[PDB]
């Protein structure tokens, strides 16, 4: 449901992420788990310590999903249908936790892209992550 302006800012920012998307996904998860320990209980099968290969590999998966989303902003429900079922039906992820990951992602992106993470880009990315979150909790 993003505006044209928001779509533009999201595609531009995600372009700047480029080949670091997996790295940023992994850092976002790490920041989520450290700042918001309630989220750790969704990953009992993971070692969640710094530098865990499971967190690293999961970050690459999350990055691939966000890249797919960026490439299909006009049909997120379709593009993310399998992931929506997984998160909402199988995992029963509490909607609040999408806010916590989204914040963690913004912190990570701001850290790495300080010139590109303008107020407008921050606002657009916030709405993007909220839209992804809505789809994955439907």
């Amino acid at each position: 449901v993003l505006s044209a302006a928001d779509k533009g800012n999201v595609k531009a920012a995600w372009g700047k992420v480029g080949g670091h998307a997996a790295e940023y996904g992994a850092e976002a998860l790490e920041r989520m788990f450290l700042s918001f320990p309630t989220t750790k209980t969704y990953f009992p099968h993971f070692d969640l310590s710094h530098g865990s290969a499971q967190v690293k590999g999961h970050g690459a998966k999350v990055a691939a999903a966000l890249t797919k989303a960026v490439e299909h902003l006009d049909d997120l429900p379709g593009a993310l249908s399998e992931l929506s079922d997984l998160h909402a039906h199988k995992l029963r992820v509490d909607p609040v936790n999408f806010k916590l990951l989204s914040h963690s992602l913004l912190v990570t992106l701001a850290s790495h892209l300080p010139s590109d993470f303008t107020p407008a880009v921050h606002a657009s990315l916030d709405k993007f992550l909220a839209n992804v979150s809505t789809v994955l909790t439907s």
């Binding site: 850092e27 450290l34 701001a110 407008a120 606002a123």
Partner: protein
């Protein structure tokens, strides 16, 4: 909150913060990213665009004062309730700001610290600052409970 050792580490980081810069940025980003918050700032003049918000001298001056209150909190981390009691009265009894927004501004401040400090704002340090901004938001909301 925090142990004495943990307080030393967050104090050391906080010493680096330029409150004028960071405060103005945090308040401006709140107004841009969460535009309903502009309801409370009609007297600040031009908030019509993102650039107007960020460059508005009243927004920058107010943000500095907001960050000075965080600096006061950083010196009284074991008594945030008392430290923020007057500000709780202002925000809750006088302005009726919904307390969800206190959490939003705290999280914007964390994003701004990340943007301004890069590598130095580590996951560990950020997690302790999450505890601090949660405590500030909780203290500010106290007059609603």
């Amino acid at each position: 909150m925090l142990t004495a050792e943990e307080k030393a580490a967050v104090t050391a980081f906080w010493g680096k913060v330029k409150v004028d810069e960071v405060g103005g940025e945090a308040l401006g980003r709140l107004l841009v990213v969460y535009p309903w918050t502009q309801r409370f700032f009609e007297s600040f003049g031009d908030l019509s665009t993102a650039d107007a918000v960020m460059n508005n001298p009243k927004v920058k001056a107010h943000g500095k004062k907001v960050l000075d209150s965080f600096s006061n909190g950083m010196k009284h981390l074991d008594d945030l309730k008392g430290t923020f009691a007057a500000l709780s009265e202002l925000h809750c009894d006088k302005l009726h700001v919904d307390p969800e927004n206190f959490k939003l501004l705290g999280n914007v401040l964390v994003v701004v610290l990340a943007r301004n400090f890069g590598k130095e704002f580590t996951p560990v340090l950020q997690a302790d600052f999450q505890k601090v901004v949660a405590g500030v938001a909780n203290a500010l909301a106290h007059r609603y409970h």
